[PDB]
Amino acid sequence: VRVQVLPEVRGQLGGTVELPCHLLPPVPGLYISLVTWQRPDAPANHQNVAAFHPKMGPSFPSPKPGSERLSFVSAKQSTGQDTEAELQDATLALHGLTVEDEGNYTCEFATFPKGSVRGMTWLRV
Amino acid sequence: MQDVRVQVLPEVRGQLGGTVELPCHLLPPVPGLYISLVTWQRPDAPANHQNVAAFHPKMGPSFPSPKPGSERLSFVSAKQSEAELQDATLALHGLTVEDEGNYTCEFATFPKGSVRGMTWLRV
C-alpha cells in the first residue's frame, strides 16, 4: 500500500551504497509487474538505471551508472517448478560510488490493479 | 537493443459532456522488448486520485482513482490475452470540467524500464 525508502542516503565515495526500497505490506490480490529505479533529473537516455521483471530478472538500461556498478540486493526472478519471484524488496546497491552518481533516485513498483507507486531517495556523497 | 519512446499529443481539447480520446502508443516495435504494464496518471491530482487507469497484459484494465473513474474511462484498443498493449489510448466519457489537466501515459517495459509521455486535456 506504500513504498518505504530512506529520504536521504550518504554514500562513501569509491565504495558501495545501498538504497533501501520496500513495498509494504504484503497484499494478496496485488501483483508487482515490474520494478524500476529512475533518476528523474537525468535525460531520458540515462533515466532508467535499473529494472526488474518477475520472470526475466534484472536489467540496467542506462549506461550510467550501468550494469557494471549496480545490483539488486534482494529482488529475485521466479525459477524452477515452484519458486516464485520476490520483488517486494527492491533495494538497489551502487558500487564504486562517484560524485556523478549523486542526485535523486526513484524506486517504482508497477503494480496491478493499483498502478504505479513510488518512493524517492536523495543520494549524496 | 533500440530505445523506445511514447507518442502522445501535447494538448487535447474535449467537448463538455462528450467523449474524447487521449492518444498514446509506444514506438517502435522492438524485438525482445516486453510491455509489462500500462498506466495513466494525473500527476497534479491528490495522492489517492493519481492512478486513473492501468492495463495488465493478462489481467486487463483497472481504474484505481475515483476521478474520472471506471464509469467514465476505457482503453480504446488495449487487449488482454496474444496481449496487445502497444496502443494505450484512453477515452474519457461524460467530460466534465474536473477532468481538465495533465494526464501521463506510461509503459513499464522490460528490459528498457519505464517510459512516459504527458498530455494536457482542455475542456
From Swiss-Prot, chain B:
Entry-listed glycosylation sites: 102
Superkingdom classification of source = Eukaryota
Q: Domain named Ig-like V-type: which ranges?
A: 2-121
Please describe, based on the UniProt annotation, the reported consequence of changing residue 59 to I. Answer: Increased entry of HHV-1/Rid1 and HSV-2
Q: What does this protein do?
A: Modulator of T-cell signaling. Can be either a costimulator of T-cell function, or a coinhibitor, depending on the receptor it binds to. Upon binding to CD226, stimulates T-cell proliferation and cytokine production, including that of IL2, IL5, IL10, IL13, and IFNG. Upon interaction with PVRIG, inhibits T-cell proliferation. These interactions are competitive. Probable cell adhesion protein. (Microbial infection) Acts as a receptor for herpes simplex virus 1 (HHV-1) mutant Rid1, herpes simplex virus 1 (HHV-2) and pseudorabies virus (PRV).
Subunit details for this protein?
Answer: Can form trans-heterodimers with NECTIN3. Interacts with CD226 or with PVRIG; these interactions are competitive and have a differential functional outcome on T-cell activation, either positive or negative, respectively. Binds with low affinity to TIGIT.
Q: What is this protein called?
A: Nectin-2
Organism, as annotated: Homo sapiens (Human)
**Top-level taxonomy:** Eukaryota, Metazoa, Chordata, Craniata, Vertebrata
Give the fragment's position in the full-length protein.
32 to 158 of 538
